[PDB]
Protein backbone atom coordinates (compact mmCIF):
# COMPACT_ATOMS: atom_id res chain seq x y z
CA UNK A 1 0.00 0.00 0.00
CA UNK A 2 2.96 2.14 -0.85
CA UNK A 3 3.09 0.94 -4.46
CA UNK A 4 2.01 -2.68 -5.02
CA UNK A 5 1.97 -5.61 -2.59
CA UNK A 6 -0.70 -8.33 -2.62
CA UNK A 7 -0.59 -11.96 -1.49
CA UNK A 8 -3.57 -14.27 -1.03
CA UNK A 9 -4.44 -15.18 2.59
CA UNK A 10 -6.80 -14.25 5.42
CA UNK A 11 -3.65 -13.40 7.39
CA UNK A 12 -3.42 -9.88 5.88
CA UNK A 13 -6.12 -9.05 8.43
CA UNK A 14 -3.87 -9.39 11.48
CA UNK A 15 -0.65 -8.04 9.91
CA UNK A 16 -2.32 -4.83 8.73
CA UNK A 17 -4.03 -4.65 12.13
CA UNK A 18 -0.60 -4.42 13.78
CA UNK A 19 0.88 -2.08 11.16
CA UNK A 20 1.02 1.71 11.47
CA UNK A 21 2.46 3.71 8.59
CA UNK A 22 4.51 6.82 9.33
CA UNK A 23 1.30 8.74 8.60
CA UNK A 24 -0.96 6.85 11.02
CA UNK A 25 1.04 7.41 14.23
CA UNK A 26 1.60 11.15 14.69
CA UNK A 27 3.42 10.24 17.93
CA UNK A 28 6.09 12.54 19.40
CA UNK A 29 9.22 11.75 21.39
CA UNK A 30 8.22 14.81 23.43
CA UNK A 31 5.01 13.00 24.46
CA UNK A 32 7.13 10.87 26.84
CA UNK A 33 8.00 11.81 30.42
CA UNK A 34 11.69 11.31 31.12
CA UNK A 35 13.77 8.49 29.61
CA UNK A 36 16.41 10.98 28.46
CA UNK A 37 19.11 8.34 28.08
CA UNK A 38 16.71 5.85 26.48
CA UNK A 39 15.50 8.42 23.95
CA UNK A 40 19.14 9.35 23.32
CA UNK A 41 20.05 5.73 22.57
CA UNK A 42 17.15 4.96 20.23
CA UNK A 43 17.57 8.33 18.50
CA UNK A 44 21.22 7.60 17.67
CA UNK A 45 20.48 3.96 16.82
CA UNK A 46 17.39 4.42 14.63
CA UNK A 47 16.76 8.03 13.63
CA UNK A 48 20.28 9.33 12.98
CA UNK A 49 21.41 6.37 10.79
CA UNK A 50 18.43 7.09 8.51
CA UNK A 51 19.15 10.83 8.25
CA UNK A 52 22.94 10.59 7.92
CA UNK A 53 23.52 7.19 6.25
CA UNK A 54 26.90 8.24 4.84
CA UNK A 55 28.11 8.48 8.45
CA UNK A 56 26.48 5.28 9.72
CA UNK A 57 28.15 2.60 7.62
CA UNK A 58 31.24 0.43 7.85
CA UNK A 59 32.54 0.56 11.41
CA UNK A 60 29.47 2.71 12.15
CA UNK A 61 26.98 0.15 10.84
CA UNK A 62 23.70 0.60 12.75
CA UNK A 63 22.24 -2.04 15.03
CA UNK A 64 19.48 -4.12 13.44
CA UNK A 65 18.00 -5.58 16.65
CA UNK A 66 17.60 -4.23 20.16
CA UNK A 67 15.85 -5.33 23.36
CA UNK A 68 14.27 -3.07 25.99
CA UNK A 69 14.29 -4.63 29.46
CA UNK A 70 12.53 -3.14 32.46
CA UNK A 71 9.65 -3.45 34.91
CA UNK A 72 6.14 -3.47 33.41
CA UNK A 73 4.44 -0.25 32.40
CA UNK A 74 7.72 1.66 32.08
CA UNK A 75 6.97 2.86 28.54
CA UNK A 76 8.79 0.40 26.27
CA UNK A 77 5.91 0.37 23.77
CA UNK A 78 5.52 4.16 23.89
CA UNK A 79 9.20 4.79 23.17
CA UNK A 80 9.00 2.15 20.43
CA UNK A 81 6.26 4.07 18.61
CA UNK A 82 7.74 7.47 19.47
CA UNK A 83 11.09 6.62 17.89
CA UNK A 84 9.27 5.18 14.86
CA UNK A 85 7.48 8.50 14.40
CA UNK A 86 10.65 10.59 14.75
CA UNK A 87 12.38 8.45 12.09
CA UNK A 88 9.51 8.08 9.57
CA UNK A 89 9.44 4.37 10.38
CA UNK A 90 6.54 2.06 9.59
CA UNK A 91 5.53 0.59 12.95
CA UNK A 92 4.65 -3.04 13.69
CA UNK A 93 3.40 -3.98 17.16
CA UNK A 94 3.49 -7.71 17.86
CA UNK A 95 3.02 -9.26 21.30
CA UNK A 96 4.74 -12.61 21.74
CA UNK A 97 1.78 -14.22 23.52
CA UNK A 98 -0.79 -12.96 20.99
CA UNK A 99 1.09 -14.92 18.33
CA UNK A 100 0.96 -18.20 20.27
CA UNK A 101 -2.84 -17.81 20.44
CA UNK A 102 -3.34 -16.57 16.86
CA UNK A 103 0.81 -17.91 13.43
CA UNK A 104 3.92 -18.78 11.43
CA UNK A 105 2.27 -17.33 8.33
CA UNK A 106 2.01 -13.97 10.13
CA UNK A 107 5.72 -13.68 10.99
CA UNK A 108 6.70 -14.31 7.37
CA UNK A 109 4.36 -11.61 6.08
CA UNK A 110 5.26 -9.41 9.07
CA UNK A 111 8.91 -9.28 8.01
CA UNK A 112 8.22 -9.44 4.27
CA UNK A 113 5.83 -6.51 4.66
CA UNK A 114 8.17 -4.66 7.04
CA UNK A 115 10.94 -4.89 4.45
CA UNK A 116 8.42 -3.71 1.84
CA UNK A 117 7.93 -0.42 3.73
CA UNK A 118 11.36 1.21 3.40
CA UNK A 119 12.59 1.83 6.99
CA UNK A 120 10.22 0.08 9.40
CA UNK A 121 10.32 -0.99 13.05
CA UNK A 122 9.03 -4.35 14.29
CA UNK A 123 8.22 -4.14 18.00
CA UNK A 124 8.00 -7.41 19.94
CA UNK A 125 6.54 -7.33 23.44
CA UNK A 126 7.20 -9.98 26.11
CA UNK A 127 9.73 -11.82 23.93
CA UNK A 128 10.88 -13.51 27.15
CA UNK A 129 7.75 -15.68 26.86
CA UNK A 130 8.93 -17.20 23.57
CA UNK A 131 12.02 -18.47 25.37
CA UNK A 132 2.64 -27.52 22.32
CA UNK A 133 4.19 -26.80 18.91
CA UNK A 134 4.66 -23.01 18.99
CA UNK A 135 8.08 -23.84 17.57
CA UNK A 136 6.41 -22.51 14.39
CA UNK A 137 7.12 -18.95 15.60
CA UNK A 138 9.48 -19.24 18.58
CA UNK A 139 12.07 -20.13 15.90
CA UNK A 140 10.43 -18.84 12.71
CA UNK A 141 11.27 -15.43 14.13
CA UNK A 142 14.97 -16.33 14.15
CA UNK A 143 14.99 -17.45 10.51
CA UNK A 144 12.96 -14.44 9.35
CA UNK A 145 15.23 -12.22 11.47
CA UNK A 146 18.63 -13.65 10.50
CA UNK A 147 17.56 -13.19 6.87
CA UNK A 148 15.96 -9.76 7.18
CA UNK A 149 19.28 -8.37 8.48
CA UNK A 150 16.03 -0.95 6.75
CA UNK A 151 14.21 -3.14 9.28
CA UNK A 152 14.97 -2.51 12.96
CA UNK A 153 13.52 -4.98 15.46
CA UNK A 154 12.91 -3.55 18.92
CA UNK A 155 11.98 -6.17 21.51
CA UNK A 156 10.67 -5.81 25.06
CA UNK A 157 10.87 -8.07 28.12
CA UNK A 158 9.78 -7.65 31.72
CA UNK A 159 11.74 -10.80 32.67
CA UNK A 160 15.13 -10.32 30.99
CA UNK A 161 16.92 -13.23 32.64
CA UNK A 162 14.26 -15.71 31.47
CA UNK A 163 15.67 -14.87 28.02
CA UNK A 164 17.25 -18.03 26.62
CA UNK A 165 20.70 -17.92 25.03
CA UNK A 166 19.14 -18.46 21.59
CA UNK A 167 17.52 -15.02 21.86
CA UNK A 168 20.34 -13.38 23.85
CA UNK A 169 22.43 -13.93 20.71
CA UNK A 170 20.19 -12.05 18.28
CA UNK A 171 19.72 -9.03 20.60
CA UNK A 172 23.20 -7.85 21.53
CA UNK A 173 22.25 -4.34 22.64
CA UNK A 174 20.23 -4.26 25.87
CA UNK A 175 18.75 -1.01 27.20
CA UNK A 176 17.68 -0.96 30.83
CA UNK A 177 14.42 0.97 31.27
CA UNK A 178 13.96 2.20 34.87
CA UNK A 179 11.05 3.51 36.97
CA UNK A 180 10.08 7.20 36.84
CA UNK A 181 11.79 9.22 39.56
CA UNK A 182 10.01 11.71 41.84
CA UNK A 183 10.22 14.49 39.25
CA UNK A 184 9.06 12.39 36.28
CA UNK A 185 6.23 11.05 38.44
CA UNK A 186 4.89 14.55 39.15
CA UNK A 187 4.75 15.44 35.46
CA UNK A 188 3.14 12.04 34.79
CA UNK A 189 0.39 12.72 37.35
CA UNK A 190 -0.20 16.21 35.96
CA UNK A 191 -0.21 14.78 32.43
CA UNK A 192 -2.76 12.10 33.32
CA UNK A 193 -4.89 14.65 35.20
CA UNK A 194 -4.83 17.11 32.29
CA UNK A 195 -8.48 17.53 31.32
CA UNK A 196 -10.15 16.16 34.45
CA UNK A 197 -12.23 18.42 36.72
CA UNK A 198 -10.31 18.58 40.00
CA UNK A 199 -9.86 20.95 42.91
CA UNK A 200 -6.82 23.22 42.98
CA UNK A 201 -6.50 21.85 46.53
CA UNK A 202 -4.50 18.90 45.16
CA UNK A 203 -0.71 19.15 45.40
CA UNK A 204 1.13 17.07 42.80
CA UNK A 205 4.34 17.07 44.87
CA UNK A 206 2.90 14.98 47.71
CA UNK A 207 1.55 12.55 45.12
CA UNK A 208 4.94 12.37 43.39
CA UNK A 209 6.52 11.59 46.77
CA UNK A 210 3.94 9.06 47.98
CA UNK A 211 4.25 6.93 44.82
CA UNK A 212 7.82 5.70 45.25
CA UNK A 213 7.91 2.34 43.46
CA UNK A 214 5.32 3.32 40.86
CA UNK A 215 5.69 2.95 37.10
CA UNK A 216 4.10 5.10 34.42
CA UNK A 217 1.23 2.63 34.14
CA UNK A 218 0.81 2.61 37.92
CA UNK A 219 0.58 6.41 37.99
CA UNK A 220 -2.12 6.54 35.32
CA UNK A 221 -3.82 3.69 37.18
CA UNK A 222 -3.70 5.78 40.36
CA UNK A 223 -5.26 8.63 38.39
CA UNK A 224 -8.07 6.52 36.90
CA UNK A 225 -8.89 5.24 40.39
CA UNK A 226 -9.05 8.68 42.00
CA UNK A 227 -11.23 9.90 39.13
CA UNK A 228 -13.71 7.06 39.69
CA UNK A 229 -13.53 7.33 43.49
CA UNK A 230 -15.73 10.38 42.92
CA UNK A 231 -18.43 7.90 41.88
CA UNK A 232 -17.72 5.77 44.96
CA UNK A 233 -17.94 8.83 47.24
CA UNK A 234 -21.52 9.29 45.99
CA UNK A 235 -24.71 7.96 47.50
CA UNK A 236 -25.48 4.76 45.60
CA UNK A 237 -29.28 4.75 45.77
CA UNK A 238 -29.51 8.18 44.13
CA UNK A 239 -27.60 6.86 41.09
CA UNK A 240 -30.01 3.98 40.43
CA UNK A 241 -32.44 3.36 37.59
CA UNK A 242 -32.14 3.28 33.83
CA UNK A 243 -33.55 6.80 33.48
CA UNK A 244 -31.50 9.98 33.93
CA UNK A 245 -31.82 11.55 37.36
CA UNK A 246 -30.77 14.86 38.85
CA UNK A 247 -28.15 13.00 40.91
CA UNK A 248 -26.39 11.82 37.74
CA UNK A 249 -26.50 15.40 36.53
CA UNK A 250 -24.64 16.33 39.72
CA UNK A 251 -22.03 13.64 39.02
CA UNK A 252 -20.68 15.76 36.15
CA UNK A 253 -19.98 18.85 38.28
CA UNK A 254 -17.89 16.73 40.66
CA UNK A 255 -14.19 17.45 41.01
CA UNK A 256 -11.47 14.97 41.92
CA UNK A 257 -10.38 15.84 45.46
CA UNK A 258 -7.46 14.93 47.72
CA UNK A 259 -9.71 12.31 49.30
CA UNK A 260 -10.00 10.62 45.92
CA UNK A 261 -6.23 10.24 45.62
CA UNK A 262 -6.06 9.18 49.27
CA UNK A 263 -8.51 6.35 48.57
CA UNK A 264 -6.69 5.50 45.34
CA UNK A 265 -3.32 5.67 47.12
CA UNK A 266 -4.53 2.93 49.49
CA UNK A 267 -6.00 0.98 46.55
CA UNK A 268 -3.36 0.77 43.81
CA UNK A 269 0.11 -0.48 44.74
CA UNK A 270 3.31 -0.65 42.68
CA UNK A 271 3.51 -3.71 40.44
CA UNK A 272 7.31 -3.38 40.13
CA UNK A 273 8.72 -5.60 42.86
CA UNK A 274 11.84 -4.49 44.73
CA UNK A 275 14.46 -7.00 43.55
CA UNK A 276 12.76 -7.12 40.12
CA UNK A 277 14.19 -3.84 38.81
CA UNK A 278 17.72 -4.94 39.67
CA UNK A 279 16.94 -8.18 37.80
CA UNK A 280 17.06 -6.01 34.66
CA UNK A 281 19.85 -3.65 35.76
CA UNK A 282 22.39 -6.43 36.34
CA UNK A 283 21.22 -8.49 33.36
CA UNK A 284 21.93 -5.55 31.03
CA UNK A 285 25.58 -5.94 32.09
CA UNK A 286 26.04 -9.74 32.02
N1 LIG B 1 7.44 7.84 30.52
C1 LIG B 1 6.11 7.87 30.24
N2 LIG B 1 5.53 8.98 29.74
C2 LIG B 1 4.22 9.03 29.46
N3 LIG B 1 3.37 8.00 29.65
C3 LIG B 1 3.82 6.82 30.15
C4 LIG B 1 5.25 6.69 30.48
N4 LIG B 1 5.42 5.44 30.94
C5 LIG B 1 4.21 4.82 30.91
N5 LIG B 1 3.25 5.64 30.44
C6 LIG B 1 1.82 5.28 30.28
O1 LIG B 1 1.68 3.90 30.63
C7 LIG B 1 0.95 3.19 29.63
C8 LIG B 1 1.61 1.84 29.36
O2 LIG B 1 2.96 2.03 28.94
P1 LIG B 1 3.67 0.98 27.94
O3 LIG B 1 4.30 1.78 26.82
O4 LIG B 1 2.66 -0.09 27.60
O5 LIG B 1 4.86 0.35 28.83
P2 LIG B 1 5.34 -1.18 28.71
O6 LIG B 1 5.83 -1.31 27.29
O7 LIG B 1 6.42 -1.33 29.75
O8 LIG B 1 4.09 -1.99 28.99
C9 LIG B 1 0.93 4.06 28.38
O9 LIG B 1 -0.40 4.15 27.86
C10 LIG B 1 1.40 5.42 28.83
O10 LIG B 1 0.33 6.37 28.70
Curated annotation (Swiss-Prot):
ATPase activity is stimulated by microtubules, which promote homooligomerization. ATP-dependent microtubule severing is stimulated by interaction with mei-2. Phosphorylated. Phosphorylation by mbk-2 is required for its rapid degradation following meiosis II. Likely dephosphorylated by the PP4 complex composed of catalytic subunit pph-4.1 and regulatory subunit ppfr-1. It is found in: Cytoplasm, Cytoskeleton, Spindle pole; Chromosome; Cytoplasm. Coiled coil: none annotated. One of its GO terms (molecular function) is microtubule severing ATPase activity. Keywords: ATP-binding, Cell cycle, Cell division, Chromosome, Cytoplasm, Cytoskeleton, Isomerase, Meiosis, Microtubule, Nucleotide-binding, Phosphoprotein, Ubl conjugation. The keyword ATP-binding applies. GO terms for biological process: cell division; embryo development ending in birth or egg hatching; female meiotic nuclear division; meiotic spindle disassembly; meiotic spindle organization; microtubule depolymerization; microtubule severing; negative regulation of meiotic spindle elongation. ATP binds at residues 70-77, 169-170. Its EC number is 5.6.1.1. Changing residue 170 to A: Severe loss of ATPase activity and complete loss of microtubule severing activity. One of its GO terms (cellular component) is meiotic spindle pole. It catalyses: n ATP + n H2O + a microtubule = n ADP + n phosphate + (n+1) alpha/beta tubulin heterodimers. Its main location: cytoplasm. Disruption phenotype: RNAi-mediated knockdown at the L1 larval stage results in the disorganization of myosin thick filaments in adult body wall muscles characterized by the formation of abnormal myosin heavy chain myo-3 aggregates and V-shaped crossing of A-bands. In addition, body wall muscle cells appear shorter and broader. Changing residue 146 to R: Severe loss of ATPase activity and complete loss of microtubule severing activity. Belongs to the AAA ATPase family. Katanin p60 subunit A1 subfamily. Catalytic subunit of a complex which severs microtubules in an ATP-dependent manner. Microtubule severing may promote rapid reorganization of cellular microtubule arrays. Required specifically for meiotic spindle formation in the female germline; the presence of this protein is inimical to the formation of mitotic spindles. In body wall muscles, regulates organization of myosin thick filaments. Homohexamer; ATP hydrolysis initiates a cycle between an open spiral and a closed ring conformation which is probably involved in pulling tubulin dimers out from microtubules. Interacts with mei-2, which may serve as a targeting subunit. Interacts with mel-26, which targets mei-1 for ubiquitin mediated proteolysis. Interacts with phosphatase pph-4.1. This is Meiotic spindle formation protein mei-1. The chain holds residues 164 to 468 of 472 of the full protein.
